[PDB]
Amino acid sequence: KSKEANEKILSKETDRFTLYPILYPDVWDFYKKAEASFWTAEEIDLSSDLKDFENDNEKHFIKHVLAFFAASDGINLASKFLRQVKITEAKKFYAFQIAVENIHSETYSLLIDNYIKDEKERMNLFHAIENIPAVKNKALWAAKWINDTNSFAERIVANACVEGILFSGSFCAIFWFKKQNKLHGLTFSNELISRDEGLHTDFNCLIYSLLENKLPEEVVQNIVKEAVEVERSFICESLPCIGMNSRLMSQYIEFVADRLLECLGSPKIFHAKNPFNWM
């Protein structure tokens, strides 16, 4: 797929010297939406969630999901796509996206600081996380699918999965706590973060649709099926599922994976419906 280096969105825009007129109104609308959705960690009121955080099986599940969010990913890819996509509308969106991932990361840190007041507990939790069978699986999948050896199209599809598939079970877990009306700053920041992550997903699906040379159906399905297994491996397995049904969560993960496929222009492969009408 790499021999197609004649892609227009991967080609330098010599003919253009300023932003207007807008050449890609649809990718520009996504930038305008991200910009208008901007929020800071300051909007999270935490005080009334530490009294609220203070059962013991829930406490344990939360500490581990926060630690996962904060520490699960190894060694930047919004920055890669910022460098290699050439259209200004797309450069703007990826650069805004790096600053929003940073707000996400800060918000998880802040949550962590509030929930685990003890620096010793917290360091112990970060070390024991950094060895989980789900953290290793993720790194294998990234190793495989986010190479400089890979095509831009495989990388864009893999990006779509990091945004739309990975973490979707932990987002769901926290939505289950919201359905229960518990832990209000966690569930509030979770719904903002999850909202951003959905925009980031549709945006890569949009970039992928600007490509004249798309992947074979089979290759898209491989990438996605594998991201599913990585995701299966955490929220009801490496960390046991405390009032949630493990099997129904597998179906929800598979449901978001099919939805991404549709979005990437491929057939569903799981045919799972959404088990949770609360999502």
Looking at this protein, which amino acid is placed at residue 24?
Answer: Y
99 lines the binding site for its own copies (CB under 8 A):
yes
Active site residue 24: no
**Residue 150: C-alpha distances to residues 84, 142, 153 (Å):** 13, 11, 8
Bind-site residues for Fe(3+): 101, 163, 197, 200
Min CB(231)–its own copies separation in Å = 23
226 lines the binding site for Fe ion (CB under 5 A):
no
Min CB(24)–its own copies separation in Å = 14
Whole-angstrom distance, CA of residue 35 vs CA of residue 120: 38
Q: Which string of x and - marks every residue 153-192 that binds Fe ion (by CB under 5 A)? A: ----------x-----------------------------
Among 197, 226, 254, 258, binds Fe ion (CB under 5 A): 197
Tokens coding 155 = 């990388």
Between 134 and 165, name the residue whose CB sits nearer to its own copies.
Answer: 134
Between 138 and 200, name the residue whose CB sits nearer to Fe ion.
Answer: 200
**Considering CB distances under 5 to 8 angstroms, the limit depending on partner class, which of its own copies, Fe ion, none binds residue 128?**
none
Largest CA distance in the chain: 62
User: Could you report how far apart the first and last alpha carbons of the chain are, in Å?
Assistant: 37
Min CB(123)–its own copies separation in Å = 7
Binding site for Fe ion (CB under 5 A): 163, 197, 200
Binding site for its own copies (CB under 8 A): 17-21, 32, 35-36, 38, 40, 42, 70-71, 79, 91-92, 95-96, 98-99, 102, 105-106, 109-110, 112-113, 122-123, 126
Q: Which residues are catalytic?
A: 108
